[PDB]
Amino acid sequence: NALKSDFDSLRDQIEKAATSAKFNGVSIADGSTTKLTFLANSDGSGFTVNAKTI
Amino acid sequence: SATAASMNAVKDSLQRGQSTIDVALAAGDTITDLLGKMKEKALAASDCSLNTASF
């Protein structure tokens, strides 16, 4: 039971840590979106960063 | 000499044309500056990672 409680505590810690990794309301670690594209060129071309849900 | 007096009349029309085109050129310079700024704003707004508040 003690080991089970330790496991549960660590899992809840993981969830808390993962859900709070937001900057400006968007994140690449929660799984809310599939990718984020930033500006890469003066003509509108994009730099794509795929989302890595952790 | 009548023709020389007529040329004296022509010079005024040419000067008025100068003034009109100068006004147009000043406005055009301002407009080109504004168009550059508009292009920058439109480029910035095309980013897909922006909030609803920055758009």
- Method used experimentally: cryo-EM
The distance of B26 to chain A (nearest Cα, Å) reads 28
User: Rounded to an integer, what distance in angstroms lies between the CA atom of residue B53 and that of residue B1?
Assistant: 74
User: Rounded to an integer, what distance in angstroms lies between the CA atom of residue A26 and that of residue B51?
Assistant: 8
Q: Is the dihedral of CA A13, A15, A18, A20 positive or negative?
A: negative
Q: List chain B gaps (C–N > 2.5 A) by preceding residue.
A: none
Q: What residues of chain B lie within 8 A of the CB of A26, using their CB?
A: 49, 51
Give this entry's resolution in angstroms.
3.2
User: Rounded to an integer, what distance in angstroms lies between the CA atom of residue A27 and that of residue A22?
Assistant: 5
Q: Is the dihedral of CA A18, A23, A24, A30 positive or negative?
A: negative
Residues 6 or more apart whose CB falls under 8 angstroms from that of B41 comprise none
- Judged by CB atoms closer than 8 Å, whether chains meet at B48 and A24 is answered as no
- Judged by CB atoms closer than 8 Å, whether chains meet at A37 and B49 is answered as yes
